[PDB]
């Protein structure tokens, strides 16, 4: 089995941990526990290949920005997560992507744009906006909701497919 080191990044409160838990432990955390750095591992099959997923849950709090150089250095794929009811959250993805490119010294680093909290009825970032921003990046965009577990497998599996195309 091949190891795929995934990294979840985004602003604080977008649902990075809630999305990670629904993938690993298959249950929705209703609490808000701001993380520093959590690590997980899961074995799964994508497109017929069995593989291990090395998942890294990062700190959205801006005080822990000095840790970003290390996990961007060792990570292979990045799941850029934003919340659809926080326009700030949508625009923060830029500064994460620019630092990933700078430490990788590359313009093509595999990553996926994820718009979380799709269960809410009020959204400040509609779908066509995030689709156009993803086209600017050249990366896929997937709508997810850690509450109802919508698109959580799709978001993580798609990031894996981006790493496969990059390795070839």
């Amino acid at each position: 089995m091949t190891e795929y080191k995934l990294v979840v990044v985004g602003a604080g409160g977008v649902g990075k941990s809630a999305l990670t838990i629904q993938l690993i432990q298959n249950h929705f955390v209703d609490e808000y526990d701001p993380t520093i750095e959590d690590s997980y591992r899961k074995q799964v099959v994508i497109d017929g290949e069995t593989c291990l997923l090395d998942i890294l849950d990062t700190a959205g709090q801006e005080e822990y920005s000095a840790m970003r150089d290390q996990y961007m250095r060792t990570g292979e794929g990045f799941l850029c997560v934003f919340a659809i009811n926080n326009t700030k959250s949508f625009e923060d993805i830029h500064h994460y992507r620019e630092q990933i490119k700078r430490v990788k010294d590359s313009e093509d680093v595999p990553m996926v744009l994820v718009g979380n909290k799709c269960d809410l009825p009020s959204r400040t970032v509609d779908t066509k906006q995030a689709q156009d921003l993803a086209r600017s990046y050249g990366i896929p965009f997937i709508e997810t909701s850690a509450k109802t577990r919508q698109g959580v497998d799709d978001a993580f599996y798609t990031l894996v497919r981006e790493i496969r195309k990059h390795k070839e």
Binding site: S17, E31, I36, E37, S39, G60, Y64, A66, M67
Partner: protein, 300 residues
């Protein structure tokens, strides 16, 4: 002098701070990082720091949905709090953490000290039982030095945490001290523990094995501060007995600190003022009075 910052520090009836609150809800989020620097330094220069903190902190708890949303994430008031910890507790953290850090690096570099407690990440030569002890020993003396540091806590922060203590107590009188201690550890103590070099405490980054242990120690220290057991990562559960015992020791330290400067750079406050001056009066006297000073003193 023709430079009147009074308008900014003007207080309405019931202490409204009309100019700052209107400036807080219209300035772009990019400049929030320096708006907190401008307002904190200005109000502190005129002995109105408590009035600024009382107004901005009240707005946060007011609009916060629940106690777990309180001061989590990055908003302007969250920037103001971290700035006050920064400019007033830098010397406090520096002289407190530097001795313990130099004991961890200069000393104990003799042995193969490893704090790796994740089994799937552990080298075959190293031992899990031994590394688990190494982490708890380091975490113990670090935690003891913080709890015993009450007599060295600077007064400006003690005023910030108490101001934070009272404002939340108006809506959540039960266990309001918990919110102070978590934000205290999450936004001030732990970020400097994880990255001592970037915080200005050390001259260079510690060795890679120490950096892994400091990161794991701050995860434990945060669990103690949040008064919550480890429930996510299975390899942090072995420390639940350690964090369950030190719950109320930190709670006593939080109850302690929560109970009762040369202004520099010649801030181009008017440069900040007029750039976001457009449509300040979107509300619902000073804006009319402000326009005369802005028209006479043209933007630079």
């Amino acid at each position: 002098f023709e430079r009147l910052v009074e308008l900014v520090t003007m207080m309405g009836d019931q202490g409204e701070l009309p100019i700052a609150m209107a400036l807080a809800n219209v300035v772009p989020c990019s400049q929030w990082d320096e708006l907190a620097r401008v307002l904190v330094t200005l109000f502190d220069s005129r002995h109105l720091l408590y009035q600024l903190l009382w107004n901005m902190f009240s707005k946060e708890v007011e609009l916060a949905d629940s106690m777990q949303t309180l001061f989590r994430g990055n908003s302007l008031a969250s920037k103001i709090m971290t700035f006050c910890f920064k400019v007033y507790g830098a010397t406090y953290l520096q002289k407190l953490l530097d001795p313990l850090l130099r004991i961890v690096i200069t000393s104990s570099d003799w042995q193969h000290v490893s704090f790796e407690v994740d089994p799937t990440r552990l080298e075959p030569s190293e031992s899990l039982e031994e590394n688990q002890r190494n982490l708890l020993q380091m975490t113990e003396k670090f935690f003891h030095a913080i709890i015993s540091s009450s007599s060295e806590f600077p007064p400006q922060l003690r005023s910030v945490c108490h101001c934070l203590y009272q404002v939340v107590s108006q809506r959540f009188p039960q266990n309001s001290i918990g919110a102070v201690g978590s934000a205290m550890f999450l936004r001030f103590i732990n970020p400097a523990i994880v990255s001592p070099y970037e915080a200005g405490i050390l001259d260079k980054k510690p060795p890679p094995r120490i950096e892994r242990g400091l990161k794991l120690m701050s995860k434990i220290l945060q669990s103690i501060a949040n008064h919550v057991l480890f429930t996510k990562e299975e390899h942090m559960r072995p420390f639940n007995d350690f964090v369950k015992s030190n719950f109320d020791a930190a709670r006593r330290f939080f109850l302690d600190i929560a109970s009762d400067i040369s202004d520099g750079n010649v801030l181009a406050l008017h440069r900040l003022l007029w750039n976001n001056q457009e449509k300040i009066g979107q509300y619902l006297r000073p804006f009319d009075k402000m326009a005369t000073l802005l028209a006479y003193l043209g933007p630079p």
